[PDB]
Design a protein around this nucleic acid. Structure first.
Ligand SMILES: [Mg+2]
Ligand SMILES: [Mg+2]
Ligand SMILES: [Mg+2]
Ligand SMILES: [Mg+2]
Ligand SMILES: [Mg+2]
Ligand SMILES: [Mg+2]
Length: 172
RNA sequence: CGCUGGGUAGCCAAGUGCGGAGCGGAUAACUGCUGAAAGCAUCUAAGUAGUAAGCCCACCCCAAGAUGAGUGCUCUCCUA
């Protein structure tokens, strides 16, 4: 289930065999492959990834870096943006200076730092949107805000991703 | 102590102070992010993040007989 990777994205690519560095309009990333897979610079415009001798570990890994290398370029060409939605009376979100602050019913305003790699913004008092390059830090970042107050069943009060479901119930 | 009433230091508690800290490290159960085999999905057979009175260090004392016997400063080795 492989596919060639589309890279006429006006992005620079460079390697030294065991690594692969990418440099584009809005960021720089790197990655190192183990000795099973191997990649070349196909001059046609795309990129194909071959593999070592047929084995169970390689067939799992063949389609693995295909999606990472895909996200490796799309995150440097366009980036990625995750969405959040705050549900509950009194729940707010602001960006005071660099980091952000949230008030999720606790007796203290939780404060977590935003690394320089990511970008955050808020349109309305009750929603948040993350913007970055790598899915790992971005997805891990948005998951962190979800952990402070996940969505409850009975009323859905809390943080939630967009385009998901909520197991609702009746309390009384 | 003939029997009693008081008693300094000392010893002692019922008296007087202090103590148990850490946004430090790695994990269990659990929740996850990213994401193949399996065009979907999946917390994972690549990688990675949160997190226990528990585990390790940190705190207090002992400690180079640690025969693996350590380290550093200083001193001494006269007369014919
Ligand atoms: Mg007396
Ligand atoms: Mg007496
Ligand atoms: Mg997932
Ligand atoms: Mg997938
Ligand atoms: Mg693993
Ligand atoms: Mg503990």
């Amino acid at each position: 289930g492989k596919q060639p990777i589309t890279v006429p994205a006006n992005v620079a690519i460079a390697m030294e065999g065991q690594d692969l560095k990418v440099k584009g309009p809005l960021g720089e990333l790197s990655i190192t492959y183990p000795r099973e897979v191997l990649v070349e610079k196909q001059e046609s415009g795309f990129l194909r990834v071959r593999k070592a001798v047929e084995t169970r570990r390689a067939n799992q890994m063949h389609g693995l870096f295909r999606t990472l290398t895909d996200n490796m370029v799309v995150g440097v060409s366009k980036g990625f943006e995750k969405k959040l939605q705050l549900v509950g009376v009194g729940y707010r979100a602001t960006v005071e200076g660099k980091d952000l602050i949230l008030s999720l019913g606790f007796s203290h305003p939780v404060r977590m730092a935003i690394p320089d790699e990511l970008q955050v913004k808020v349109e309305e008092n009750t929603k948040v949107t993350v913007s970055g390059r790598d899915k790992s830090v971005v997805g891990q970042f948005a998951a962190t805000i979800r952990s402070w107050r996940p969505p409850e069943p009975y009323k859905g009060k809390g943080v939630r991703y967009v385009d998901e479901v909520v197991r609702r119930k009746e309390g009384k």
